[PDB]
């Protein structure tokens, strides 16, 4: 194997063989939340439920959550279809908008001159003379010459003059303007509502409904992740924080943002507003890779299967975008409007699956490990040695999977860092961690209900059995195959794990 | 170090430094048939103008061809900031259409450098193209388009007997689904990368620009991946053929494909190609490998390669140098023709052959050296590789020598 | 990081670290039949005593055998500082003589652990040896002696059906030239090293020592290379059977074979062995692999295998750790037989099986861990590997555990 | 492929198919100086003639050098058997010895050492005399003292001014005028003896190629030999011998002052234990390959052949491992020098060193160098790599380097290509000073310089090409790598050529 030989090897007439190891994330809204539909999506690929909180009442969303779990335990008895499904709360996050034009729309021209006001007296009065935006400190951030984007980039402006609560500007790019539309100020250290006053109410609601992770919107500094961390508080200290990066300053300070966050979202489109089309894919590839390094998870969202909103199949251009995002090393890719409000929210999960599977054939597979095996330094942490021993063993006998008995999920994280080829089956009694686990590439979680036992050995022996049967049923392996097992820690005890190579009964 | 460590280091705040190494092909048409316009399209990065035969009588084309050439030479007053422009005949196709035979003869006798042959499915399907071009077109390079499913099915044999390959993704995503086409593309490119023959990615490039001065970041990303998949050229269509911002289109494509460059892992692309290549015994190839290895060993500003038929510069290119291959030639066909090759920056020598064979060589090498300087690639004091023959008439380019810029 | 950088680093002023990992076999005769002597030979490094069955009859062997065991057990005082001592019957042959079969029967029925069967040629021969030993001694180990050109000619099939190989360079020196014999030795040792089956090389070791208390530096060198070639044991002949300094001869063999260690480059020997070996369906192999691989990842002070059969400890040995393999066993034949393998230090558990498994395992594991400390292999605080089973009477050793020395 | 796979491939029924690439050094005296014998040895593999200066009058040696160059140019009548034999001067160097036994005498007993010159011819098993005047100055109570081929170690119970009283340890038949050793003390200079300077002078005069400086124990020691050879001998290669502990101790500085190294195994074997010597060997050879510098393995090699027609298997293998460790040249002594089989030894020596090539991990060796080696700004380095790569790209029969100095054909060797480097030269010295280098085969150009550089190159290239065919390095219709030289002004840059064999 060389990488290039591997590319020449590819075969579009050969059917996928590997598990899809990328977790699918779906945004639930209007078209998706009916328990029956929700049931179909779980069954047909879904791994996480996104809640878009720039909308809804809490009563709206709490019902949506209730439906999710209804559909989840709808499969309670059957090992063939039982999968954890997780719930993710995506805050609305700090944002700027324009006013209401005559409150309906105006029209903007090229090169023309625009004035902007903070003056709320000019809130519902809005047009080509003056525009108003809810940001009150815009003058202490923006300087002369600064470009300002408006309504999904579609209209840019600059800055000729700036004083106190006004700014005279000059349109660089034109197009029809409208009411209450989004505004970005590229390269600008946007002064802070760290978390919105709304966000704290949705964060608290989040803690209340036992969500798994928060996708914290619009993150710029370390402190920002630290805010959501604190607001979540002792009450919510196992809620995973995934910071969205949606603007230039995020890419800039991305190093400390990853240190603080539990994970990372690449908002491609929102990135596309403040930084040029020719530069974004670098920034994506950079962030993804830096996460793969950090061992933290990375979600790839925006502009995925959006064709599927009105058609039952995606454009080939879109087939590409996802695949070459699987490949740069995203753990998960998130569907947006195609599940939340489309006319094909079902095919969308279906396609997104089909696609993410095909793409596994092009993952440079065996080599991925072989590299970090070597270069990896010498430890003294036994847990490290044990995982290598496991992934090594994994490869010594083409095992069909590596069953890891974990509470936290940590021990099955470690193992995934060494990127084995065979899937990791993370077996857990903590129904949380089972969910907070789709965030991780090539980990397939499995919920153990059978309860704790006195003698460690016979307890371990039990869940290994559980995994073995689930595994047989999914088709991870037959009888008379070998599999690698990490037990957990014994509960005396030295905090040491145990690697086992056991044949499948 | 590592592929991954590369990705981690990427920075969208530090300007690209390497030059674009992927060749921009453009489809010329109503939006761009203007001589006055083409003077801005090659100044902005066009390296091949493509003619779409699907819509034309010869007088339609012949005038356009003439208009291309007319604007090419409008720079000849500076022999170094000057650059070749090939011309491409893209057949209308459906085997070999009998309309086409009437059109191939037009090309053959219009000095077209390459033929993008259409709906190619077999060896017979390209052999049949070949003979039609005849002895008056034994040179002219034919690039098969893979469009049906069978092209991907019988690809090796097509590659076996073609000069180039064009993947037309649109016309692929129609016979085969989306979950599979990107797979098809990656394999093809990769397979041309091995065999040495050049490959170009076409269709759905910067389409959104047909009605807008900037493109979608989804398009920036589709184009750059073709770059990094190992493509030599990306070809524009409606963006410059019938578009509304054709010039603006080209400049973007350049901009993109230059950014893209920051993400190619050379230090391993080379390594793998070198490892796969056979032990063959062209004196002329063995120099290339040596030439590349040495370019890496001293971090050379460029590899200068004096060549007749291009084939020398081709070989150096096969092994993917980090540094630019400046091909120096008089044969201005294999010079225009050069552009279907990654990282080759061909340059036309207009100086009358010199009396002494040493004097001749020294002139051409000092030319490339002066092109390379003003063009940006190196500065006085740097180190460059240089390939020349040992004597003249040697059916070989097999001298290699590391020499400082003056 | 490089074979060469290792070589440059060596130091004749730096006292050695590693324990000798190569087995010392000695030949018992007049100079060493003594019990008073043997008590000083095993104390000084003998791990397998060899009875030379060319010149002798059974009563004289039986007294020597008994002499050995009498001095062996004379250290049973501490169950920790005591070492197994295997017993070797070296047949005389010139296929299988009547005198052999008579002598083999004496061996099979004397608890001998291994038979060095002489002048083996084709596959048929070891087979003819097997039969002789029958079900009575199915356990005894067959070490094929290679002594002429036919051995080296048909070596694969021989190896394919012996338990081990002895290279007799002297007797191999007669049959083929000097300039080729090292070539032959290097290949055999290396072929055994692959196959996993242990190799001993003998003859021309420390002959000079028969008369002198110290050997020639060319003997120092010849032995050390046999070590570095990948031998498991080097065996002394006349040096200790007749020599005026037989005991003095062993300490040197140790001393040399220990210094030799500093020039082994494990950090590759492992990587190569591993790269060559195929995938298993057997859990007990895969664990070894993982264990040795883990032993490098954390620089483990040792690898502790708990084994019945031996096969568990043998596996770990095949992949060649830097770390010493302490095999803990009850079966004291395997404990003895264990000496045939590089870097396995076998220990005998004289403790009676415990009631619970947990109980049983934890005792044997604390055994090695104590023996370990007692020797030099680790100190309190170090990390070690530990390879037990899961349920008892399981077909396998397949538990990998990384534990701190208490 | 992998090292171990390689070890498994080895076939003793398959005949050697590689150039010997270890140059053979023979010691010449009594048994070997007849021109007619020297002829048969040159034909049979000799590459360097050693002269042992512990003996012989200058006119003795003077003649011996002449007979060599007589038999050398005996073949120059053609270019096919003609090899550039080289001449090496081996100083006798500093020595400490003991007087005449009052021809000798002889465990646990107590013995007295005297500086007292009156006792010179008055030696016996109670009193012993030795030159080294400062012997007591570099000793404490309990320092070992070895005597007569290490045969008699001794400690020291007490010392004062002009006497040492001490205990026997190892014993056996003493003799007279037998050497003594002090492991491992900073032994007193002069580095170069009085006799040494006379012989180094005669060396420069008789135009030898290299000197083998005996007993080198520091950098100072090297520089003394160098300044003695002086401006007149500035191109005579110095190969420091390492014969004691201290040499090994300070071996780093000794290696950069020297042009080369000799591992005196047996002399090493008397001051440092038999269990440690082979480490010292591998260590020194090892550091030398890393240094570019040549390494010669001497002593113990074929001494069995002094009285038998063939060597013992232990001896065969010792040499083979000396080759494999990384030695460029392995030197014969008494077996060529004064034996009953001198021709037969150079034969066996060659045979062995060839067989051994099959077990050198050939194609791998290079691959490490390519990666590990850094970035240069030194065009000459890149061209070398370019050449060796090209060498490998088409399995060249050889890599022909046109060199004056030999510098450039050295680089190429630093990168361990697998094809023989045929070094083509006009300077008939840097041409003999060239066997000291592994897998370099020199060839002497007689044909004279031309003003048209292009055609001067074209000429020697042709020369080499023909030599090469005849030696058997390559047929016609093969490819070969060429480095031309530097030009003539000029840009000091070399030129790599892939040329087919006409
Ligand atoms: O199935 C499914 C789990 C979640 C991430 C990928 N594997
Ligand atoms: O421009 C010009 C050359 C052609 C290929 C890449 N750049
Ligand atoms: O001692 C004892 C074990 C046997 C092989 C080497 N060390
Ligand atoms: O011929 C002979 C070559 C020169 C030195 C090494 N071997």
Q: What is the DSSP string of D308-359?
A: SSS--HHHHHHHHHHHHHT-SEEE--HHHHS-S-SHHHHHHHHHHHHHGGGG
Q: Apex CA C147: angle with CA C143 and CA C148, to 5°?
A: 135
Using the mean position of ligand 1's atoms as its centre, give its distance from the Cα of residue A23 in Å: 5
Q: Please tell me the distance from the alpha carbon of residue B116 to that of residue D299, in angstroms, as a whole number.
A: 73
* Residue in B with minimal Cα distance to A371: B2
Kindly give the interhelix angle for C246-259 and C217-230, rounded to the nearest 10 degrees: 50
CB D409 within 8 A of CB D383: no
Q: Please tell me the distance from the alpha carbon of residue B295 to that of residue A443, in angstroms, as a whole number.
A: 44
Structure tokens given for C271 = 């990587």
CB D327 within 8 A of CB D296: yes
Greatest CA separation for chain C:
61
CB atoms within 10 A of CB A366: 10
Q: Please tell me the distance from the alpha carbon of residue D300 to that of residue D98, in angstroms, as a whole number.
A: 24
Beta strands in B319-396 (DSSP E): 325-329, 347-348, 383-388
Domain covering D95-189 in this structure, CATH number = 2.40.33.10
Of the ligands numbered here, which is closest to the C-alpha atom of C324?
Answer: 3
Coil, strand or helix: which one is A349?
helix
Q: Can you list the alpha helix ranges (DSSP code H) found in A295-399? A: 316-326, 337-340, 345-358, 365-375, 382-396
Neighbors of chain B by Cβ distance (3+ pairs < 8 Å): A, D
* Bond before D490 cis per omega within 30 degrees: yes
Nearest residue to D414 via CA among D316, D294, D308: D294
CB atoms within 10 A of CB C361: 18
- Beta strand C303-306 pairing with C325-329: parallel
What is the DSSP secondary structure assignment for residue C338, as one 8-state letter?
G
The DSSP H or E segment spanning A155 is: strand A155-157
The DSSP H or E segment spanning B228 is: helix B217-230
Tokens 């032994």: give the residue: D187
Least CB-CB distance to B297: which of D382, D454, D496?
Answer: D382
Interface size between B and D, measured as CB pairs under 8 A? 94
Contacts of B193 in chain A (CB under 8 A): 4, 7
Domain ranges for chain B: 1-19+261-405, 20-93+95-260
Closest-CA distance of chain B to residue A251, Å: 9
Q: For residue A171, what are the β-bridge partners? A: A157
Q: Please tell me the distance from the alpha carbon of residue A461 to that of residue A55, in angstroms, as a whole number.
A: 47
The DSSP H or E segment spanning D51 is: strand D46-52
Q: Which atom of ligand 4 is nearest to the CA of D329?
A: 6
A18 class by beta-carbon count within 10 Å (0-12 exposed, 13-18 middle, 19+ buried): middle
Structure tokens given for D274 = 């038999």
Edge-to-edge strands, sheet with A424-428: A443-447, A424-428, A402-405, A482-486, A499-503, C399-404, C383-387, C303-306, C325-329, C347-348
- Beta strand A161-162 pairing with A166-173: antiparallel
Q: Kindly provide the b/e burial profile for residues A155-165, where b requires at least 16 CB atoms within 10 angstroms of the residue's own CB.
A: bbbebeebeee
The answer, for A386 touching chain C at a CB cutoff of 8 Å, is: yes
Looking at the structure, give the CATH architecture of the domain made up of residues C1-19+261-405.
Answer: 3-Layer(aba) Sandwich (3.40)
Please give the C-alpha separations between residue D97 and each of A71, B53, D94, D102, D130, in angstroms, as whole numbers: 101, 101, 10, 15, 5
Q: For residue A48, what are the β-bridge partners? A: A25, A86
Nearest residue to D21 via CA among D356, D325, D283: D356
What lies within 8 Å, CB to CB, of D499 at 6+ separation is B283, B390, B398, D461, D479, D480, D482
Greatest CA separation for chain B:
61
What lies within 8 Å, CB to CB, of D79 at 6+ separation is D443, D466, D467, D470
Using the mean position of ligand 1's atoms as its centre, give its distance from the Cα of residue A83 in Å: 9
The DSSP H or E segment spanning A58 is: helix A58-73
Q: Please tell me the distance from the alpha carbon of residue A195 to that of residue D382, in angstroms, as a whole number.
A: 58
Q: What is the C-alpha end-to-end distance of chain A, expressed in Å?
A: 33
CB D331 within 8 A of CB D50: yes
Q: Please tell me the distance from the alpha carbon of residue D179 to that of residue D130, in angstroms, as a whole number.
A: 9
Q: Please tell me the distance from the alpha carbon of residue B244 to that of residue C170, in angstroms, as a whole number.
A: 91
What is the DSSP secondary structure assignment for residue B26, as one 8-state letter?
E
Q: Please tell me the distance from the alpha carbon of residue A221 to that of residue D435, in angstroms, as a whole number.
A: 68
Q: Please tell me the distance from the alpha carbon of residue B63 to that of residue B28, in angstroms, as a whole number.
A: 12
* Bond before D184 cis per omega within 30 degrees: yes
Q: Please tell me the distance from the alpha carbon of residue B56 to that of residue B52, in angstroms, as a whole number.
A: 8
The answer, for D368 touching chain C at a CB cutoff of 8 Å, is: yes
Nearest residue to A194 via CA among A219, A212, A215, A214: A219
Q: How far from the centroid of its chain's Cα atoms is residue B243's Cα?
A: 23
Q: Please tell me the distance from the alpha carbon of residue A299 to that of residue A266, in angstroms, as a whole number.
A: 6
Q: Please tell me the distance from the alpha carbon of residue D433 to that of residue D413, in angstroms, as a whole number.
A: 14
CB contact under 8 A, C280 and A379: no
Greatest CA separation for chain A:
79
Tokens 């006349």: give the residue: C238
CB C225 within 8 A of CB C234: no
CB atoms within 10 A of CB A407: 13
Structure tokens given for A181 = 């539309």
Using the mean position of ligand 3's atoms as its centre, give its distance from the Cα of residue C84 in Å: 9
Nearest residue to C113 via CA among C156, C142, C75, C144: C142
Tokens 């970035």: give the residue: D375
Q: Please tell me the distance from the alpha carbon of residue C17 to that of residue C250, in angstroms, as a whole number.
A: 19
CB contact under 8 A, D275 and C262: no
Whats the size of chain B, residue-wise? 406
Q: Please tell me the distance from the alpha carbon of residue B334 to that of residue B352, in angstroms, as a whole number.
A: 18
CB A279 within 8 A of CB B262: no
CATH topology of domain A20-94+193-362: TIM Barrel (3.20.20)
Contacts of B383 in chain D (CB under 8 A): 377, 379, 382
Domain covering D1-19+360-502 in this structure, CATH number = 3.40.1380.20
The experimental technique behind this entry is: X-ray
What lies within 8 Å, CB to CB, of B400 at 6+ separation is B287, B290, B291, B294, B385, B386, B387, D383, D386, D495, D496, D497
Least CB-CB distance to A496: which of C293, C300, C401?
Answer: C401
Coil, strand or helix: which one is C234?
strand
Q: Please tell me the distance from the alpha carbon of residue B4 to that of residue A293, in angstroms, as a whole number.
A: 8
Considering Cα of A384, then A387, then A391, then A392, what sign does the dihedral take? positive
One DSSP character per residue, C155-194 reads HHHHHTTSSEEEEEHHHHHHHS-HHHHHHHHHHHHHHHHH
Closest-CA distance of chain D to residue C401, Å: 30
Pocket of ligand 3 contains residue C339 by CB under 6 Å: yes
- Beta strand D440-444 pairing with D421-425: parallel
CB atoms within 10 A of CB A383: 16
Nearest residue to D398 via CA among D409, D382, D383: D409
Q: Please tell me the distance from the alpha carbon of residue D299 to that of residue D247, in angstroms, as a whole number.
A: 17
Q: For residue D389, what are the β-bridge partners? A: none
Of the ligands numbered here, which is closest to the C-alpha atom of C347?
Answer: 3
Looking at the structure, give the CATH architecture of the domain made up of residues A95-192.
Answer: Beta Barrel (2.40)
Of D21, D43, D323, the one to substitute when testing ligand 4's pocket (max ligand atoms within 8 A of C-beta) is D21
Q: Apex CA A438: angle with CA A432 and CA A440, to 5°?
A: 115
Nearest residue to A468 via CA among A483, A458, A456, A453: A483
Q: Please tell me the distance from the alpha carbon of residue B304 to that of residue A29, in angstroms, as a whole number.
A: 61
Domain covering A1-19+363-505 in this structure, CATH number = 3.40.1380.20
Nearest residue to B49 via CA among B67, B27, B70, B34: B27
CB C117 within 8 A of CB C125: yes
| Resolution of the entry in angstroms | 3.2
**Domain C20-93+95-260: homologous superfamily in CATH:** Phosphoenolpyruvate-binding domains (3.20.20.60)
Q: Apex CA D58: angle with CA D57 and CA D64, to 5°?
A: 95
Taking CB atoms within 8 Å and a gap of at least 24, the contacts of A67-71 are: A67/A33, A67/A34, A67/A35, A67/A38, A68/A28, A68/A38, A70/A35, A70/A38, A71/A35, A71/A38, A71/A39, A71/A42
Structure tokens given for A435 = 């969910």
Of the ligands numbered here, which is closest to the C-alpha atom of D46?
Answer: 4
Q: Please tell me the distance from the alpha carbon of residue C233 to that of residue C200, in angstroms, as a whole number.
A: 5
Q: How far from the centroid of its chain's Cα atoms is residue B230's Cα?
A: 12
Q: What is the C-alpha end-to-end distance of chain D, expressed in Å?
A: 33
What lies within 8 Å, CB to CB, of B156 at 6+ separation is B191
Count of CA atoms in the C-beta half-sphere (13 A) of A385: 29
Interface test with C, best of D267, D271, D276, D311 (most C CBs within 10 A): D276
Q: For residue C86, what are the β-bridge partners? A: C48
CB contact under 8 A, D2 and C275: yes
The answer, for B382 touching chain D at a CB cutoff of 8 Å, is: no
Nearest residue to B118 via CA among B149, B77, B80, B89: B89
CB B228 within 8 A of CB B263: yes
CB contact under 8 A, B290 and D393: yes
Please give the C-alpha separations between residue A173 and each of A112, A156, A170, A270, B214, in angstroms, as whole numbers: 10, 5, 9, 18, 11
Q: Apex CA A260: angle with CA A259 and CA A262, to 5°?
A: 95
Q: Please tell me the distance from the alpha carbon of residue C232 to that of residue C164, in angstroms, as a whole number.
A: 10
Q: Please tell me the distance from the alpha carbon of residue B266 to that of residue D39, in angstroms, as a whole number.
A: 56
CB A83 within 8 A of CB A41: no
Considering Cα of D32, then D36, then D38, then D42, what sign does the dihedral take? negative
Q: Please tell me the distance from the alpha carbon of residue B184 to that of residue A320, in angstroms, as a whole number.
A: 11
Catalytic residue set of A: 50, 97, 244, 302
Domain covering D20-94+190-359 in this structure, CATH number = 3.20.20.60
Least CB-CB distance to C7: which of D286, D320, D321?
Answer: D286
CB atoms within 10 A of CB B272: 17
The DSSP H or E segment spanning A334 is: strand A332-334
CB contact under 8 A, B12 and A282: yes
| Residues 308-367, chain B, touching D (beta carbon < 8 A) | 358
Structure tokens given for B38 = 């083409």
Coil, strand or helix: which one is D23?
strand
Q: How far from the centroid of its chain's Cα atoms is residue B114's Cα?
A: 11
Q: Please tell me the distance from the alpha carbon of residue C28 to that of residue C241, in angstroms, as a whole number.
A: 5
CB contact under 8 A, A386 and C400: yes
CB A411 within 8 A of CB A497: yes
Structure tokens given for B371 = 């092109």
CB C310 within 8 A of CB C338: yes
Nearest residue to C178 via CA among D310, D207, D186: D310
What lies within 8 Å, CB to CB, of D467 at 6+ separation is D79, D80, D422, D443
The DSSP H or E segment spanning C357 is: helix C357-374
Q: Please tell me the distance from the alpha carbon of residue D366 to that of residue D414, in angstroms, as a whole number.
A: 9
Tokens 């003793």: give the residue: D12
Q: Please tell me the distance from the alpha carbon of residue A99 to that of residue B67, in angstroms, as a whole number.
A: 52
Q: Please tell me the distance from the alpha carbon of residue A352 to that of residue A322, in angstroms, as a whole number.
A: 8
Kindly give the interhelix angle for C217-230 and D277-289, rounded to the nearest 10 degrees: 70
């Amino acid at each position: 194997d060389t990488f290039l030989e591997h590319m020449c090897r590819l075969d579009i007439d050969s059917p996928p063989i590997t598990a899809r190891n990328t977790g699918i994330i779906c945004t639930i809204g209007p078209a998706s939340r009916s328990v029956e539909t929700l049931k179909e999506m779980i069954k047909s690929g879904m791994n996480v439920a996104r809640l878009n909180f720039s909308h809804g009442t809490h009563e709206y969303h709490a019902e949506t959550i209730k439906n999710v779990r209804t559909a989840t335990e709808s499969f309670a008895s059957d090992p063939i279809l039982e999968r954890p499904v997780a719930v993710a709360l995506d805050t609305k996050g700090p944002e700027i908008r324009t006013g209401l034009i005559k409150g309906a729309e105006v029209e903007l021209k090229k090169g023309a001159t625009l004035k902007i006001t903070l003056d709320n007296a000019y809130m519902e009065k809005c047009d080509e003379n003056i525009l108003w935006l809810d940001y009150k400190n815009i003058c202490k951030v923006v300087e002369v010459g600064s470009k300002i984007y408006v309504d999904d980039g579609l209209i840019s402006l600059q800055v000729k003059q700036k004083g106190a609560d006004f700014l005279v500007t000059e349109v660089e790019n034109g197009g029809s303007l409208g009411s209450k539309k989004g505004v970005n100020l590229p390269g600008a250290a946007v002064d802070l509502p760290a978390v919105s006053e709304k966000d704290i109410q949705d964060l608290k609601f989040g803690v209340e409904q036992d969500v798994d992770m928060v996708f914290a919107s619009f993150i710029r500094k370390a402190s920002d992740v630290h805010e959501v961390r604190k607001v979540l508080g002792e009450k919510g200290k196992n809620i995973k924080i995934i910071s969205k990066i949606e603007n230039h300053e995020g890419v800039r300070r991305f190093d400390e943002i990853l240190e603080a966050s539990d994970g990372i979202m690449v908002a491609r489109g929102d990135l596309g507003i403040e930084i040029p089309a020719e530069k974004v894919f670098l920034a994506q590839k950079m962030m993804i890779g830096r996460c793969n390094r950090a061992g933290k998870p990375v979600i790839c969202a925006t502009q995925m299967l959006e064709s599927m909103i009105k058609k039952p199949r995606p454009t080939r251009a879109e087939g590409s975008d996802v695949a070459n995002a699987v490949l740069d090393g995203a753990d998960c890719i998130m569907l947006s409007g195609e599940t939340a409000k489309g006319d094909y929210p079902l095919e969308a999960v279906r396609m997104q699956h089909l696609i993410a599977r095909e793409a596994e054939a092009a993952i440079y597979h065996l080599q991925l490990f072989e590299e970090l095996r070597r270069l990896a330094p010498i430890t003294s942490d036994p847990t490290e040695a044990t995982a290598v021993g496991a992934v090594e063993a994994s490869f010594k006998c083409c095992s069909g999977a590596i069953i890891v008995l974990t509470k936290s999920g940590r021990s099955a994280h470690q193992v995934a860092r060494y990127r084995p080829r065979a899937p990791i089956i993370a077996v857990t009694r903590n129904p949380q961690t089972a969910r907070q686990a789709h965030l991780y590439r090539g980990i397939f979680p499995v919920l153990c209900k059978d309860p704790v036992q006195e003698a460690w050995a016979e307890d371990v022996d039990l869940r290994v059995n559980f995994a073995m049967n689930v595994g047989k049923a999914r088709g991870f392996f037959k009888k008379g195959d070998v599999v690698i097992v990490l037990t957990g820690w014994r509960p005396g005890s030295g905090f040491t794990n145990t690697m086992r190579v056991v044949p499948v009964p």
